Amino acid sequence: SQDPYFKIANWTNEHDDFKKAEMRMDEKHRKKVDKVMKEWGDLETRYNEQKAKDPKGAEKFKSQMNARFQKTVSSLEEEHKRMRKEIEAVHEERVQAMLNEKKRDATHDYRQALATHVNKPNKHSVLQSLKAYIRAEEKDRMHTLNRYRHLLKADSKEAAAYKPTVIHRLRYIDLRINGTLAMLRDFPDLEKYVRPIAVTYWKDYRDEVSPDISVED
Numbered sequence: 001s002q003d004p005y006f007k008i009a010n011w012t013n014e015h016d017d018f019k020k021a022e023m024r025m026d027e028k029h030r031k032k033v034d035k036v037m038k039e040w041g042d043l044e045t046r047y048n049e050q051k052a053k054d055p056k057g058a059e060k061f062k063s064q065m066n067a068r069f070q071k072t073v074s075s076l077e078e079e080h081k082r083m084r085k086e087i088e089a090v091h092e093e094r095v096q097a098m099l100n101e102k103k104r105d106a107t108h109d110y111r112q113a114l115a116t117h118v119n120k121p122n123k124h125s126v127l128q129s130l131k132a133y134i135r136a137e138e139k140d141r142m143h144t145l146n147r148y149r150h151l152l153k154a155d156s157k158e159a160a161a162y163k164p165t166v167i168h169r170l171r172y173i174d175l176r177i178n179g180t181l182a183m184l185r186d187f188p189d190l191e192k193y194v195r196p197i198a199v200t201y202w203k204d205y206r207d208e209v210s211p212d213i214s215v216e217d
C-alpha cells in the first residue's frame with residue numbers, strides 16, 4: 001500500500017496531515033540512513049583489521065566498498081528528494097485549492113452582505129465579511145511568499161524559476177483586494193464608514209501575518 005495521507009478528503013486539516021506524513025517520511029528515511037551508516041562502520045572496521053594483514057587485498061576492499069557506499073548514498077538521497085517533491089506538490093495543491101475555497105466563500109458572504117444592505121443596514125456584517133475576504137487573500141500571499149523563501153534556501157535555482165510567478169501572484173492579490181474594495185464605491189452611505197476601517201485592517205493584518213525582515217537577502 002501507500003501512505004494514507006494521499007487519499008484524504010476533508011483537506012480541512014491539511015497542515016496537520018502533511019506535517020504528520022512528513023514526519024512519517026522523514027523518519028522512515030532516517031531508518032535507512034542509519035542502516036547504511038552502520039553498514040559503513042562494520043565495513044570500515046574490517047578495513048582497519050585487515051589493514052596490516054592483507055594490505056593488498058585489504059586496500060582493494062576499500063576502493064571497492066567506497067564505490068558501493070558512495071553509490072548507495074546517492075541512491076537514497078535521490079529517493080528521498082523524489083518522495084519529498086511528490087508530497088509537496090500534493091500539499092501545495094490542496095493548500096491552494098483550500099485557500100481558494102476560503103476566497104470563494106468569503107466573497108459570497110461579502111456580496112450577500114452588500115445586497116442585503118441595499119434594503120436594510122447590514123452595516124457590521126458587510127465589514128466582517130470583507131475582513132474575512134482580506135484574511136483569505138492575504139493568507140494566499142503569506143503562503144506564497146513563504147514558498148519562495150523555502151525554495152530560496154533549498155534550490156537557488158528552482159527558486160529563480162518561480163520569482164516571475166511569485167511577482168504575478170502578489171500583483172493580482174492586490175488587484176483583487178483593491179477591486180473588492182471598489183465595490184463599496186456604490187454605497188456612499190457605507191463606503192464612508194466601512195472603507196477606512198477595512199483598509200487599516202488590511203495594512204494591519206498584513207503587518208502581522210507577512211511582515212518585512214532585516215536578517216538577509
Ligand SMILES: O=S(=O)(O)OC[C@H]1O[C@H](O)[C@H](OS(=O)(=O)O)[C@@H](OS(=O)(=O)O)[C@@H]1OS(=O)(=O)O
Pocket residue numbers: 012013014015016017139143
Ligand atoms: O491543517 S490545519 O490544522 O487546518 O492548519 C491550522 C494552522 O496551522 C498553522 O498554524 C498555519 O500557519 S502556517 O504558518 O503553517 O500557515 C495556519 O495558517 S494561518 O492561520 O493562515 O497562518 C493554520 O490555520 S488555518 O486557519 O489557516 O488552517
